[PDB]
Amino acid sequence: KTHVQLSLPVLQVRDVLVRGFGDSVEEVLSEARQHLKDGTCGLVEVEKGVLPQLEQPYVFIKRSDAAPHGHVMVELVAELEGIQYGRSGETLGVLVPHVGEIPVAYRKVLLRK
């Protein structure tokens, strides 16, 4: 399918144990997509002071359109040293590996895959 319904655990930034997906824009988009397929991806909501506590390159989920079955349609955009790779809508959050951190909420998304 071109889209997959996922329910992403929303993590507090200070709980996150693995603070990024890797070392290059291509690697972090690859690993983010793998962890989204495997159910091992968390979401951190972006506010003042969050991104400097995480590792670049960043992977964002961004709104791709204006929400089937309560799932916002999203796509992936990476960022490194102030340059973005992809073009999309409003940020819903930054993706990180999930390794058993307790979430505060879930974010229902329809991921363009």
From Swiss-Prot:
Give the region (Disordered) as residue ranges.
Answer: 1-113
| Cellular location(s) | Host cytoplasm
List residues of the CoV Nsp1 globular domain. 2-113
Function in brief: Inhibits host translation by associating with the open head conformation of the 40S subunit. The C-terminus binds to and obstructs ribosomal mRNA entry tunnel. Thereby inhibits antiviral response triggered by innate immunity or interferons. The nsp1-40S ribosome complex further induces an endonucleolytic cleavage near the 5'UTR of host mRNAs, targeting them for degradation. This inhibits the integrated stress response (ISR) in the infected cell by preventing EIF2S1/eIF2-alpha phosphorylation upstream of stress granule formation and depletes host G3BP1.
The protein depicted here goes by the name Host translation inhibitor nsp1
Recorded source organism is: Severe acute respiratory syndrome coronavirus 2 (2019-nCoV)
Species classification: Viruses, Riboviria, Orthornavirae, Pisuviricota, Pisoniviricetes
Shown chain mapped onto the complete sequence: 11 to 125 of 7096
